[PDB]
Amino acid sequence: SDKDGKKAKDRKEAWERIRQAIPREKTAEAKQRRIELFKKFDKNETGKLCYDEVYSGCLEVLKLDEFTSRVRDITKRAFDKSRTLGSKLENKGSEDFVEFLEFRLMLCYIYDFFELTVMFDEIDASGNMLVDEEEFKRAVPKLEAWGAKVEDPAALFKELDKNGTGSVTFDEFAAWASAVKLDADGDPDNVP
């Protein structure tokens, strides 16, 4: 009852829009789109967003539900992570709200996580949003190219297969790689 109801087709079509909708690039052009986007989320104009606010905007502004029927889950992941990377770049301790910086990083995280999902769709034979060992290994060079090297594929496969079922979930695989790409990319407003 927590299985994602979207198939590869649904994701591929939603990604056409989403990949254009989320301003993830390190350009001045995207930098402004991010402000515009942040104002749509920050209805209370506090410049601090709690999870329900981020979730509402993810739902109603970004329309993430086109891509996945688990908006809750992806939103929470992005919310948590962006809060953790925010601490780092500012060299301050973490807060339990998302200020503009973290919002920017959330946008990038969701972008990366969805981009990876669409990629994994191309390799998931069962259409169950899991990858077996063989499919995992075919993803590995595409990830290196996309910006997340797997130095030890067999070790990563074992580590991410949390309960030892012999597949890795899209959520675990995509969370690993987005966390790498995010921390790599950093603040996209910091441009060049």
Side-chain angles (χ1 to χ4, degrees), residues 9-22 66-67 110-116 118-119:
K9 187 66 112 225
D10 296 330
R11 288 190 285 278
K12 184 156 151 43
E13 313 189 353
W15 185 240
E16 294 186 3
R17 175 189 53 90
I18 295 162
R19 83 182 97 171
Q20 288 173 323
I22 297 171
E66 204 191 351
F67 185 87
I110 296 158
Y111 185 102
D112 294 340
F113 195 108
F114 284 10
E115 204 171 32
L116 285 161
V118 166
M119 179 198 300

mmCIF file with all atom_site columns, all heavy atoms in Angstrom, residues 9-22 66-67 110-116 118-119:
data_model
loop_
_atom_site.group_PDB
_atom_site.id
_atom_site.type_symbol
_atom_site.label_atom_id
_atom_site.label_alt_id
_atom_site.label_comp_id
_atom_site.label_asym_id
_atom_site.label_entity_id
_atom_site.label_seq_id
_atom_site.pdbx_PDB_ins_code
_atom_site.Cartn_x
_atom_site.Cartn_y
_atom_site.Cartn_z
_atom_site.occupancy
_atom_site.B_iso_or_equiv
_atom_site.pdbx_formal_charge
_atom_site.auth_seq_id
_atom_site.auth_comp_id
_atom_site.auth_asym_id
_atom_site.auth_atom_id
_atom_site.pdbx_PDB_model_num
ATOM 1   N N   . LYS A 1 9   ? 6.827  4.823  -18.209 1.00 0.00 ? 9   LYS A N   1
ATOM 2   C CA  . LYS A 1 9   ? 6.058  5.727  -19.088 1.00 0.00 ? 9   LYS A CA  1
ATOM 3   C C   . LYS A 1 9   ? 5.538  7.025  -18.387 1.00 0.00 ? 9   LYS A C   1
ATOM 4   O O   . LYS A 1 9   ? 5.706  8.132  -18.883 1.00 0.00 ? 9   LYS A O   1
ATOM 5   C CB  . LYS A 1 9   ? 4.870  4.946  -19.625 1.00 0.00 ? 9   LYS A CB  1
ATOM 6   C CG  . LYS A 1 9   ? 4.068  5.707  -20.686 1.00 0.00 ? 9   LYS A CG  1
ATOM 7   C CD  . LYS A 1 9   ? 4.915  5.916  -21.963 1.00 0.00 ? 9   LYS A CD  1
ATOM 8   C CE  . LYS A 1 9   ? 4.386  5.096  -23.190 1.00 0.00 ? 9   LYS A CE  1
ATOM 9   N NZ  . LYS A 1 9   ? 5.487  4.391  -23.946 1.00 0.00 ? 9   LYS A NZ  1
ATOM 10  N N   . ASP A 1 10  ? 4.842  6.857  -17.276 1.00 0.00 ? 10  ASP A N   1
ATOM 11  C CA  . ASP A 1 10  ? 4.396  7.977  -16.464 1.00 0.00 ? 10  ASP A CA  1
ATOM 12  C C   . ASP A 1 10  ? 5.563  8.895  -16.072 1.00 0.00 ? 10  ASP A C   1
ATOM 13  O O   . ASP A 1 10  ? 5.472  10.129 -16.224 1.00 0.00 ? 10  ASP A O   1
ATOM 14  C CB  . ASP A 1 10  ? 3.716  7.482  -15.199 1.00 0.00 ? 10  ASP A CB  1
ATOM 15  C CG  . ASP A 1 10  ? 2.441  6.688  -15.478 1.00 0.00 ? 10  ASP A CG  1
ATOM 16  O OD1 . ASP A 1 10  ? 1.736  6.924  -16.471 1.00 0.00 ? 10  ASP A OD1 1
ATOM 17  O OD2 . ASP A 1 10  ? 2.144  5.799  -14.692 1.00 0.00 ? 10  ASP A OD2 1
ATOM 18  N N   . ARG A 1 11  ? 6.639  8.292  -15.573 1.00 0.00 ? 11  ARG A N   1
ATOM 19  C CA  . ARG A 1 11  ? 7.838  9.047  -15.181 1.00 0.00 ? 11  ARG A CA  1
ATOM 20  C C   . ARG A 1 11  ? 8.483  9.741  -16.370 1.00 0.00 ? 11  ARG A C   1
ATOM 21  O O   . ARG A 1 11  ? 8.857  10.912 -16.265 1.00 0.00 ? 11  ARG A O   1
ATOM 22  C CB  . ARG A 1 11  ? 8.846  8.162  -14.414 1.00 0.00 ? 11  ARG A CB  1
ATOM 23  C CG  . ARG A 1 11  ? 8.337  7.857  -13.054 1.00 0.00 ? 11  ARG A CG  1
ATOM 24  C CD  . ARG A 1 11  ? 9.376  7.186  -12.164 1.00 0.00 ? 11  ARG A CD  1
ATOM 25  N NE  . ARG A 1 11  ? 9.530  5.800  -12.567 1.00 0.00 ? 11  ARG A NE  1
ATOM 26  C CZ  . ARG A 1 11  ? 8.729  4.825  -12.200 1.00 0.00 ? 11  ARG A CZ  1
ATOM 27  N NH1 . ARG A 1 11  ? 7.707  5.062  -11.368 1.00 0.00 ? 11  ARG A NH1 1
ATOM 28  N NH2 . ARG A 1 11  ? 8.963  3.602  -12.668 1.00 0.00 ? 11  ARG A NH2 1
ATOM 29  N N   . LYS A 1 12  ? 8.565  9.063  -17.512 1.00 0.00 ? 12  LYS A N   1
ATOM 30  C CA  . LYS A 1 12  ? 9.238  9.647  -18.655 1.00 0.00 ? 12  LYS A CA  1
ATOM 31  C C   . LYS A 1 12  ? 8.506  10.903 -19.166 1.00 0.00 ? 12  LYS A C   1
ATOM 32  O O   . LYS A 1 12  ? 9.145  11.932 -19.471 1.00 0.00 ? 12  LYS A O   1
ATOM 33  C CB  . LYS A 1 12  ? 9.444  8.611  -19.757 1.00 0.00 ? 12  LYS A CB  1
ATOM 34  C CG  . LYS A 1 12  ? 10.241 9.081  -20.976 1.00 0.00 ? 12  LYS A CG  1
ATOM 35  C CD  . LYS A 1 12  ? 10.866 7.887  -21.687 1.00 0.00 ? 12  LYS A CD  1
ATOM 36  C CE  . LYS A 1 12  ? 11.037 8.122  -23.191 1.00 0.00 ? 12  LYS A CE  1
ATOM 37  N NZ  . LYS A 1 12  ? 11.556 9.503  -23.478 1.00 0.00 ? 12  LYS A NZ  1
ATOM 38  N N   . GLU A 1 13  ? 7.178  10.796 -19.250 1.00 0.00 ? 13  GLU A N   1
ATOM 39  C CA  . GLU A 1 13  ? 6.305  11.923 -19.604 1.00 0.00 ? 13  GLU A CA  1
ATOM 40  C C   . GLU A 1 13  ? 6.330  13.087 -18.576 1.00 0.00 ? 13  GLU A C   1
ATOM 41  O O   . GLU A 1 13  ? 6.449  14.223 -18.982 1.00 0.00 ? 13  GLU A O   1
ATOM 42  C CB  . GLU A 1 13  ? 4.875  11.433 -19.938 1.00 0.00 ? 13  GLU A CB  1
ATOM 43  C CG  . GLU A 1 13  ? 4.811  10.190 -20.933 1.00 0.00 ? 13  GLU A CG  1
ATOM 44  C CD  . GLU A 1 13  ? 3.385  9.840  -21.446 1.00 0.00 ? 13  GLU A CD  1
ATOM 45  O OE1 . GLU A 1 13  ? 2.418  10.458 -20.942 1.00 0.00 ? 13  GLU A OE1 1
ATOM 46  O OE2 . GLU A 1 13  ? 3.237  8.957  -22.362 1.00 0.00 ? 13  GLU A OE2 1
ATOM 47  N N   . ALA A 1 14  ? 6.265  12.804 -17.260 1.00 0.00 ? 14  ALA A N   1
ATOM 48  C CA  . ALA A 1 14  ? 6.331  13.854 -16.233 1.00 0.00 ? 14  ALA A CA  1
ATOM 49  C C   . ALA A 1 14  ? 7.686  14.561 -16.209 1.00 0.00 ? 14  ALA A C   1
ATOM 50  O O   . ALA A 1 14  ? 7.770  15.762 -15.933 1.00 0.00 ? 14  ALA A O   1
ATOM 51  C CB  . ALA A 1 14  ? 5.995  13.276 -14.838 1.00 0.00 ? 14  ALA A CB  1
ATOM 52  N N   . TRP A 1 15  ? 8.746  13.802 -16.471 1.00 0.00 ? 15  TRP A N   1
ATOM 53  C CA  . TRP A 1 15  ? 10.096 14.314 -16.516 1.00 0.00 ? 15  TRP A CA  1
ATOM 54  C C   . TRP A 1 15  ? 10.259 15.353 -17.655 1.00 0.00 ? 15  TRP A C   1
ATOM 55  O O   . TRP A 1 15  ? 10.990 16.330 -17.483 1.00 0.00 ? 15  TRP A O   1
ATOM 56  C CB  . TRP A 1 15  ? 11.089 13.151 -16.647 1.00 0.00 ? 15  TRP A CB  1
ATOM 57  C CG  . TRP A 1 15  ? 12.511 13.547 -16.576 1.00 0.00 ? 15  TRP A CG  1
ATOM 58  C CD1 . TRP A 1 15  ? 13.479 13.361 -17.554 1.00 0.00 ? 15  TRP A CD1 1
ATOM 59  C CD2 . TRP A 1 15  ? 13.156 14.253 -15.499 1.00 0.00 ? 15  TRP A CD2 1
ATOM 60  N NE1 . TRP A 1 15  ? 14.678 13.892 -17.125 1.00 0.00 ? 15  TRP A NE1 1
ATOM 61  C CE2 . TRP A 1 15  ? 14.516 14.435 -15.873 1.00 0.00 ? 15  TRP A CE2 1
ATOM 62  C CE3 . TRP A 1 15  ? 12.721 14.740 -14.250 1.00 0.00 ? 15  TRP A CE3 1
ATOM 63  C CZ2 . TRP A 1 15  ? 15.448 15.100 -15.049 1.00 0.00 ? 15  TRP A CZ2 1
ATOM 64  C CZ3 . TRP A 1 15  ? 13.666 15.423 -13.413 1.00 0.00 ? 15  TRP A CZ3 1
ATOM 65  C CH2 . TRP A 1 15  ? 15.005 15.591 -13.826 1.00 0.00 ? 15  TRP A CH2 1
ATOM 66  N N   . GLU A 1 16  ? 9.621  15.158 -18.817 1.00 0.00 ? 16  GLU A N   1
ATOM 67  C CA  . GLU A 1 16  ? 9.568  16.189 -19.876 1.00 0.00 ? 16  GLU A CA  1
ATOM 68  C C   . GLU A 1 16  ? 9.272  17.586 -19.293 1.00 0.00 ? 16  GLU A C   1
ATOM 69  O O   . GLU A 1 16  ? 9.830  18.588 -19.709 1.00 0.00 ? 16  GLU A O   1
ATOM 70  C CB  . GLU A 1 16  ? 8.519  15.838 -20.970 1.00 0.00 ? 16  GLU A CB  1
ATOM 71  C CG  . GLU A 1 16  ? 8.847  14.578 -21.829 1.00 0.00 ? 16  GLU A CG  1
ATOM 72  C CD  . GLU A 1 16  ? 7.868  14.312 -23.026 1.00 0.00 ? 16  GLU A CD  1
ATOM 73  O OE1 . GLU A 1 16  ? 6.936  15.111 -23.290 1.00 0.00 ? 16  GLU A OE1 1
ATOM 74  O OE2 . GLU A 1 16  ? 8.041  13.272 -23.701 1.00 0.00 ? 16  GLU A OE2 1
ATOM 75  N N   . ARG A 1 17  ? 8.343  17.641 -18.337 1.00 0.00 ? 17  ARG A N   1
ATOM 76  C CA  . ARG A 1 17  ? 7.934  18.917 -17.780 1.00 0.00 ? 17  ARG A CA  1
ATOM 77  C C   . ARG A 1 17  ? 8.823  19.318 -16.597 1.00 0.00 ? 17  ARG A C   1
ATOM 78  O O   . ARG A 1 17  ? 9.388  20.425 -16.547 1.00 0.00 ? 17  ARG A O   1
ATOM 79  C CB  . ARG A 1 17  ? 6.449  18.875 -17.365 1.00 0.00 ? 17  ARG A CB  1
ATOM 80  C CG  . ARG A 1 17  ? 5.982  20.188 -16.643 1.00 0.00 ? 17  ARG A CG  1
ATOM 81  C CD  . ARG A 1 17  ? 4.593  20.121 -16.034 1.00 0.00 ? 17  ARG A CD  1
ATOM 82  N NE  . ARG A 1 17  ? 4.409  18.980 -15.141 1.00 0.00 ? 17  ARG A NE  1
ATOM 83  C CZ  . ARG A 1 17  ? 4.650  18.965 -13.835 1.00 0.00 ? 17  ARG A CZ  1
ATOM 84  N NH1 . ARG A 1 17  ? 5.096  20.050 -13.184 1.00 0.00 ? 17  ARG A NH1 1
ATOM 85  N NH2 . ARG A 1 17  ? 4.406  17.833 -13.169 1.00 0.00 ? 17  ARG A NH2 1
ATOM 86  N N   . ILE A 1 18  ? 8.930  18.395 -15.653 1.00 0.00 ? 18  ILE A N   1
ATOM 87  C CA  . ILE A 1 18  ? 9.672  18.573 -14.443 1.00 0.00 ? 18  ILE A CA  1
ATOM 88  C C   . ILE A 1 18  ? 11.120 19.008 -14.662 1.00 0.00 ? 18  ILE A C   1
ATOM 89  O O   . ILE A 1 18  ? 11.580 19.941 -13.979 1.00 0.00 ? 18  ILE A O   1
ATOM 90  C CB  . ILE A 1 18  ? 9.541  17.312 -13.517 1.00 0.00 ? 18  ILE A CB  1
ATOM 91  C CG1 . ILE A 1 18  ? 8.090  17.183 -13.067 1.00 0.00 ? 18  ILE A CG1 1
ATOM 92  C CG2 . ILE A 1 18  ? 10.429 17.455 -12.295 1.00 0.00 ? 18  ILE A CG2 1
ATOM 93  C CD1 . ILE A 1 18  ? 7.689  15.799 -12.512 1.00 0.00 ? 18  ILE A CD1 1
ATOM 94  N N   . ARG A 1 19  ? 11.827 18.375 -15.599 1.00 0.00 ? 19  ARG A N   1
ATOM 95  C CA  . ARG A 1 19  ? 13.216 18.739 -15.891 1.00 0.00 ? 19  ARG A CA  1
ATOM 96  C C   . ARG A 1 19  ? 13.378 20.175 -16.422 1.00 0.00 ? 19  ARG A C   1
ATOM 97  O O   . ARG A 1 19  ? 14.503 20.694 -16.530 1.00 0.00 ? 19  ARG A O   1
ATOM 98  C CB  . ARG A 1 19  ? 13.850 17.737 -16.872 1.00 0.00 ? 19  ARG A CB  1
ATOM 99  C CG  . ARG A 1 19  ? 13.544 17.996 -18.371 1.00 0.00 ? 19  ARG A CG  1
ATOM 100 C CD  . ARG A 1 19  ? 14.179 16.929 -19.286 1.00 0.00 ? 19  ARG A CD  1
ATOM 101 N NE  . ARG A 1 19  ? 13.236 15.875 -19.657 1.00 0.00 ? 19  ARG A NE  1
ATOM 102 C CZ  . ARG A 1 19  ? 13.467 14.923 -20.570 1.00 0.00 ? 19  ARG A CZ  1
ATOM 103 N NH1 . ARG A 1 19  ? 14.620 14.882 -21.233 1.00 0.00 ? 19  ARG A NH1 1
ATOM 104 N NH2 . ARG A 1 19  ? 12.537 13.997 -20.822 1.00 0.00 ? 19  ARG A NH2 1
ATOM 105 N N   . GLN A 1 20  ? 12.266 20.800 -16.802 1.00 0.00 ? 20  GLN A N   1
ATOM 106 C CA  . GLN A 1 20  ? 12.265 22.165 -17.342 1.00 0.00 ? 20  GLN A CA  1
ATOM 107 C C   . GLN A 1 20  ? 11.755 23.075 -16.232 1.00 0.00 ? 20  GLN A C   1
ATOM 108 O O   . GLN A 1 20  ? 12.251 24.188 -16.037 1.00 0.00 ? 20  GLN A O   1
ATOM 109 C CB  . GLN A 1 20  ? 11.358 22.272 -18.586 1.00 0.00 ? 20  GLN A CB  1
ATOM 110 C CG  . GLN A 1 20  ? 11.900 21.602 -19.871 1.00 0.00 ? 20  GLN A CG  1
ATOM 111 C CD  . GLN A 1 20  ? 10.885 21.595 -21.026 1.00 0.00 ? 20  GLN A CD  1
ATOM 112 O OE1 . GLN A 1 20  ? 9.675  21.422 -20.815 1.00 0.00 ? 20  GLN A OE1 1
ATOM 113 N NE2 . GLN A 1 20  ? 11.380 21.781 -22.258 1.00 0.00 ? 20  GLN A NE2 1
ATOM 114 N N   . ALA A 1 21  ? 10.776 22.569 -15.497 1.00 0.00 ? 21  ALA A N   1
ATOM 115 C CA  . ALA A 1 21  ? 10.170 23.274 -14.370 1.00 0.00 ? 21  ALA A CA  1
ATOM 116 C C   . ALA A 1 21  ? 11.087 23.574 -13.185 1.00 0.00 ? 21  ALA A C   1
ATOM 117 O O   . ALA A 1 21  ? 10.984 24.661 -12.588 1.00 0.00 ? 21  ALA A O   1
ATOM 118 C CB  . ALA A 1 21  ? 8.891  22.559 -13.882 1.00 0.00 ? 21  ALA A CB  1
ATOM 119 N N   . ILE A 1 22  ? 11.947 22.627 -12.811 1.00 0.00 ? 22  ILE A N   1
ATOM 120 C CA  . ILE A 1 22  ? 12.816 22.842 -11.666 1.00 0.00 ? 22  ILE A CA  1
ATOM 121 C C   . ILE A 1 22  ? 14.071 23.511 -12.160 1.00 0.00 ? 22  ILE A C   1
ATOM 122 O O   . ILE A 1 22  ? 14.716 22.991 -13.045 1.00 0.00 ? 22  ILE A O   1
ATOM 123 C CB  . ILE A 1 22  ? 13.193 21.545 -10.949 1.00 0.00 ? 22  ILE A CB  1
ATOM 124 C CG1 . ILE A 1 22  ? 11.950 20.865 -10.375 1.00 0.00 ? 22  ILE A CG1 1
ATOM 125 C CG2 . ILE A 1 22  ? 14.217 21.854 -9.869  1.00 0.00 ? 22  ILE A CG2 1
ATOM 126 C CD1 . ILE A 1 22  ? 12.269 19.450 -9.848  1.00 0.00 ? 22  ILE A CD1 1
ATOM 127 N N   . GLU A 1 66  ? 2.705  14.090 -10.481 1.00 0.00 ? 66  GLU A N   1
ATOM 128 C CA  . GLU A 1 66  ? 2.684  13.571 -11.825 1.00 0.00 ? 66  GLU A CA  1
ATOM 129 C C   . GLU A 1 66  ? 3.716  12.460 -11.976 1.00 0.00 ? 66  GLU A C   1
ATOM 130 O O   . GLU A 1 66  ? 3.526  11.550 -12.787 1.00 0.00 ? 66  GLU A O   1
ATOM 131 C CB  . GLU A 1 66  ? 2.973  14.667 -12.814 1.00 0.00 ? 66  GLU A CB  1
ATOM 132 C CG  . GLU A 1 66  ? 2.424  14.395 -14.191 1.00 0.00 ? 66  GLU A CG  1
ATOM 133 C CD  . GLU A 1 66  ? 2.968  15.375 -15.199 1.00 0.00 ? 66  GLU A CD  1
ATOM 134 O OE1 . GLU A 1 66  ? 3.618  16.345 -14.755 1.00 0.00 ? 66  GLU A OE1 1
ATOM 135 O OE2 . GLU A 1 66  ? 2.776  15.153 -16.422 1.00 0.00 ? 66  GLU A OE2 1
ATOM 136 N N   . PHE A 1 67  ? 4.784  12.529 -11.169 1.00 0.00 ? 67  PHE A N   1
ATOM 137 C CA  . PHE A 1 67  ? 6.009  11.721 -11.383 1.00 0.00 ? 67  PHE A CA  1
ATOM 138 C C   . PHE A 1 67  ? 5.970  10.531 -10.519 1.00 0.00 ? 67  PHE A C   1
ATOM 139 O O   . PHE A 1 67  ? 6.381  9.463  -10.931 1.00 0.00 ? 67  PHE A O   1
ATOM 140 C CB  . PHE A 1 67  ? 7.261  12.510 -11.061 1.00 0.00 ? 67  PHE A CB  1
ATOM 141 C CG  . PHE A 1 67  ? 8.572  11.772 -11.386 1.00 0.00 ? 67  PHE A CG  1
ATOM 142 C CD1 . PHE A 1 67  ? 9.119  11.850 -12.657 1.00 0.00 ? 67  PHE A CD1 1
ATOM 143 C CD2 . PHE A 1 67  ? 9.187  10.944 -10.434 1.00 0.00 ? 67  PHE A CD2 1
ATOM 144 C CE1 . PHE A 1 67  ? 10.326 11.174 -12.969 1.00 0.00 ? 67  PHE A CE1 1
ATOM 145 C CE2 . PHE A 1 67  ? 10.399 10.275 -10.736 1.00 0.00 ? 67  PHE A CE2 1
ATOM 146 C CZ  . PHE A 1 67  ? 10.952 10.382 -12.013 1.00 0.00 ? 67  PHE A CZ  1
ATOM 147 N N   . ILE A 1 110 ? 15.779 16.925 -5.669  1.00 0.00 ? 110 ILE A N   1
ATOM 148 C CA  . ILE A 1 110 ? 14.593 16.323 -6.306  1.00 0.00 ? 110 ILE A CA  1
ATOM 149 C C   . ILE A 1 110 ? 14.893 16.131 -7.785  1.00 0.00 ? 110 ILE A C   1
ATOM 150 O O   . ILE A 1 110 ? 14.605 15.056 -8.390  1.00 0.00 ? 110 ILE A O   1
ATOM 151 C CB  . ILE A 1 110 ? 13.344 17.259 -6.208  1.00 0.00 ? 110 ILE A CB  1
ATOM 152 C CG1 . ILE A 1 110 ? 12.913 17.479 -4.764  1.00 0.00 ? 110 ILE A CG1 1
ATOM 153 C CG2 . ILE A 1 110 ? 12.176 16.821 -7.160  1.00 0.00 ? 110 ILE A CG2 1
ATOM 154 C CD1 . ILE A 1 110 ? 12.073 18.818 -4.659  1.00 0.00 ? 110 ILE A CD1 1
ATOM 155 N N   . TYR A 1 111 ? 15.524 17.150 -8.354  1.00 0.00 ? 111 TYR A N   1
ATOM 156 C CA  . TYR A 1 111 ? 15.913 17.088 -9.748  1.00 0.00 ? 111 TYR A CA  1
ATOM 157 C C   . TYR A 1 111 ? 16.783 15.869 -9.978  1.00 0.00 ? 111 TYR A C   1
ATOM 158 O O   . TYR A 1 111 ? 16.514 15.094 -10.875 1.00 0.00 ? 111 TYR A O   1
ATOM 159 C CB  . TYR A 1 111 ? 16.644 18.375 -10.170 1.00 0.00 ? 111 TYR A CB  1
ATOM 160 C CG  . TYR A 1 111 ? 16.958 18.381 -11.656 1.00 0.00 ? 111 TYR A CG  1
ATOM 161 C CD1 . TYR A 1 111 ? 16.181 19.124 -12.546 1.00 0.00 ? 111 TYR A CD1 1
ATOM 162 C CD2 . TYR A 1 111 ? 18.021 17.609 -12.171 1.00 0.00 ? 111 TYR A CD2 1
ATOM 163 C CE1 . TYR A 1 111 ? 16.449 19.086 -13.939 1.00 0.00 ? 111 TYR A CE1 1
ATOM 164 C CE2 . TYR A 1 111 ? 18.324 17.589 -13.538 1.00 0.00 ? 111 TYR A CE2 1
ATOM 165 C CZ  . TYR A 1 111 ? 17.522 18.314 -14.423 1.00 0.00 ? 111 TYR A CZ  1
ATOM 166 O OH  . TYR A 1 111 ? 17.824 18.339 -15.785 1.00 0.00 ? 111 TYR A OH  1
ATOM 167 N N   . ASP A 1 112 ? 17.809 15.687 -9.140  1.00 0.00 ? 112 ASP A N   1
ATOM 168 C CA  . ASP A 1 112 ? 18.776 14.604 -9.305  1.00 0.00 ? 112 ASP A CA  1
ATOM 169 C C   . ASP A 1 112 ? 18.069 13.246 -9.099  1.00 0.00 ? 112 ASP A C   1
ATOM 170 O O   . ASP A 1 112 ? 18.278 12.327 -9.871  1.00 0.00 ? 112 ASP A O   1
ATOM 171 C CB  . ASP A 1 112 ? 19.905 14.726 -8.282  1.00 0.00 ? 112 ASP A CB  1
ATOM 172 C CG  . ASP A 1 112 ? 20.787 15.955 -8.478  1.00 0.00 ? 112 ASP A CG  1
ATOM 173 O OD1 . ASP A 1 112 ? 20.799 16.526 -9.583  1.00 0.00 ? 112 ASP A OD1 1
ATOM 174 O OD2 . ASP A 1 112 ? 21.474 16.347 -7.492  1.00 0.00 ? 112 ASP A OD2 1
ATOM 175 N N   . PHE A 1 113 ? 17.279 13.141 -8.047  1.00 0.00 ? 113 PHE A N   1
ATOM 176 C CA  . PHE A 1 113 ? 16.597 11.907 -7.654  1.00 0.00 ? 113 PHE A CA  1
ATOM 177 C C   . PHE A 1 113 ? 15.658 11.426 -8.752  1.00 0.00 ? 113 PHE A C   1
ATOM 178 O O   . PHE A 1 113 ? 15.663 10.240 -9.084  1.00 0.00 ? 113 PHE A O   1
ATOM 179 C CB  . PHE A 1 113 ? 15.879 12.107 -6.308  1.00 0.00 ? 113 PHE A CB  1
ATOM 180 C CG  . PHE A 1 113 ? 15.435 10.827 -5.631  1.00 0.00 ? 113 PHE A CG  1
ATOM 181 C CD1 . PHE A 1 113 ? 16.075 10.365 -4.493  1.00 0.00 ? 113 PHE A CD1 1
ATOM 182 C CD2 . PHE A 1 113 ? 14.276 10.167 -6.057  1.00 0.00 ? 113 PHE A CD2 1
ATOM 183 C CE1 . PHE A 1 113 ? 15.608 9.228  -3.840  1.00 0.00 ? 113 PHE A CE1 1
ATOM 184 C CE2 . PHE A 1 113 ? 13.825 9.025  -5.421  1.00 0.00 ? 113 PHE A CE2 1
ATOM 185 C CZ  . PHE A 1 113 ? 14.469 8.544  -4.368  1.00 0.00 ? 113 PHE A CZ  1
ATOM 186 N N   . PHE A 1 114 ? 14.939 12.348 -9.386  1.00 0.00 ? 114 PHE A N   1
ATOM 187 C CA  . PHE A 1 114 ? 14.021 12.016 -10.504 1.00 0.00 ? 114 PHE A CA  1
ATOM 188 C C   . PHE A 1 114 ? 14.812 11.662 -11.781 1.00 0.00 ? 114 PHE A C   1
ATOM 189 O O   . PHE A 1 114 ? 14.475 10.702 -12.477 1.00 0.00 ? 114 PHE A O   1
ATOM 190 C CB  . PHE A 1 114 ? 13.064 13.191 -10.751 1.00 0.00 ? 114 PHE A CB  1
ATOM 191 C CG  . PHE A 1 114 ? 11.923 13.313 -9.726  1.00 0.00 ? 114 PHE A CG  1
ATOM 192 C CD1 . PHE A 1 114 ? 11.905 12.567 -8.566  1.00 0.00 ? 114 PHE A CD1 1
ATOM 193 C CD2 . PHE A 1 114 ? 10.853 14.202 -9.969  1.00 0.00 ? 114 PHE A CD2 1
ATOM 194 C CE1 . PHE A 1 114 ? 10.835 12.691 -7.635  1.00 0.00 ? 114 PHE A CE1 1
ATOM 195 C CE2 . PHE A 1 114 ? 9.766  14.332 -9.052  1.00 0.00 ? 114 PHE A CE2 1
ATOM 196 C CZ  . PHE A 1 114 ? 9.783  13.566 -7.876  1.00 0.00 ? 114 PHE A CZ  1
ATOM 197 N N   . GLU A 1 115 ? 15.875 12.420 -12.064 1.00 0.00 ? 115 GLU A N   1
ATOM 198 C CA  . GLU A 1 115 ? 16.738 12.129 -13.212 1.00 0.00 ? 115 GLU A CA  1
ATOM 199 C C   . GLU A 1 115 ? 17.298 10.711 -13.046 1.00 0.00 ? 115 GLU A C   1
ATOM 200 O O   . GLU A 1 115 ? 17.399 9.979  -13.992 1.00 0.00 ? 115 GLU A O   1
ATOM 201 C CB  . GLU A 1 115 ? 17.955 13.071 -13.329 1.00 0.00 ? 115 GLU A CB  1
ATOM 202 C CG  . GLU A 1 115 ? 18.419 13.088 -14.778 1.00 0.00 ? 115 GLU A CG  1
ATOM 203 C CD  . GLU A 1 115 ? 19.434 14.113 -15.064 1.00 0.00 ? 115 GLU A CD  1
ATOM 204 O OE1 . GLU A 1 115 ? 20.252 14.454 -14.187 1.00 0.00 ? 115 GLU A OE1 1
ATOM 205 O OE2 . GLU A 1 115 ? 19.379 14.617 -16.186 1.00 0.00 ? 115 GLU A OE2 1
ATOM 206 N N   . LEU A 1 116 ? 17.650 10.328 -11.826 1.00 0.00 ? 116 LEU A N   1
ATOM 207 C CA  . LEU A 1 116 ? 18.213 8.982  -11.637 1.00 0.00 ? 116 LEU A CA  1
ATOM 208 C C   . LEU A 1 116 ? 17.165 7.932  -11.799 1.00 0.00 ? 116 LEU A C   1
ATOM 209 O O   . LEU A 1 116 ? 17.457 6.788  -12.201 1.00 0.00 ? 116 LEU A O   1
ATOM 210 C CB  . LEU A 1 116 ? 18.824 8.847  -10.215 1.00 0.00 ? 116 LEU A CB  1
ATOM 211 C CG  . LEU A 1 116 ? 20.184 9.589  -10.079 1.00 0.00 ? 116 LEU A CG  1
ATOM 212 C CD1 . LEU A 1 116 ? 20.474 9.812  -8.597  1.00 0.00 ? 116 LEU A CD1 1
ATOM 213 C CD2 . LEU A 1 116 ? 21.360 8.929  -10.921 1.00 0.00 ? 116 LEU A CD2 1
ATOM 214 N N   . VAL A 1 118 ? 14.550 7.909  -13.769 1.00 0.00 ? 118 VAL A N   1
ATOM 215 C CA  . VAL A 1 118 ? 14.251 7.755  -15.175 1.00 0.00 ? 118 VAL A CA  1
ATOM 216 C C   . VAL A 1 118 ? 15.326 6.876  -15.836 1.00 0.00 ? 118 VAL A C   1
ATOM 217 O O   . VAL A 1 118 ? 15.014 5.962  -16.586 1.00 0.00 ? 118 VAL A O   1
ATOM 218 C CB  . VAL A 1 118 ? 14.116 9.143  -15.803 1.00 0.00 ? 118 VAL A CB  1
ATOM 219 C CG1 . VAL A 1 118 ? 14.151 9.086  -17.377 1.00 0.00 ? 118 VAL A CG1 1
ATOM 220 C CG2 . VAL A 1 118 ? 12.844 9.771  -15.266 1.00 0.00 ? 118 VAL A CG2 1
ATOM 221 N N   . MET A 1 119 ? 16.577 7.125  -15.482 1.00 0.00 ? 119 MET A N   1
ATOM 222 C CA  . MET A 1 119 ? 17.730 6.291  -15.870 1.00 0.00 ? 119 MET A CA  1
ATOM 223 C C   . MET A 1 119 ? 17.580 4.810  -15.436 1.00 0.00 ? 119 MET A C   1
ATOM 224 O O   . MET A 1 119 ? 17.835 3.885  -16.243 1.00 0.00 ? 119 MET A O   1
ATOM 225 C CB  . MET A 1 119 ? 19.018 6.913  -15.253 1.00 0.00 ? 119 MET A CB  1
ATOM 226 C CG  . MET A 1 119 ? 20.310 6.144  -15.542 1.00 0.00 ? 119 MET A CG  1
ATOM 227 S SD  . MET A 1 119 ? 21.722 6.520  -14.459 1.00 0.00 ? 119 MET A SD  1
ATOM 228 C CE  . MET A 1 119 ? 21.923 8.295  -14.782 1.00 0.00 ? 119 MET A CE  1
#
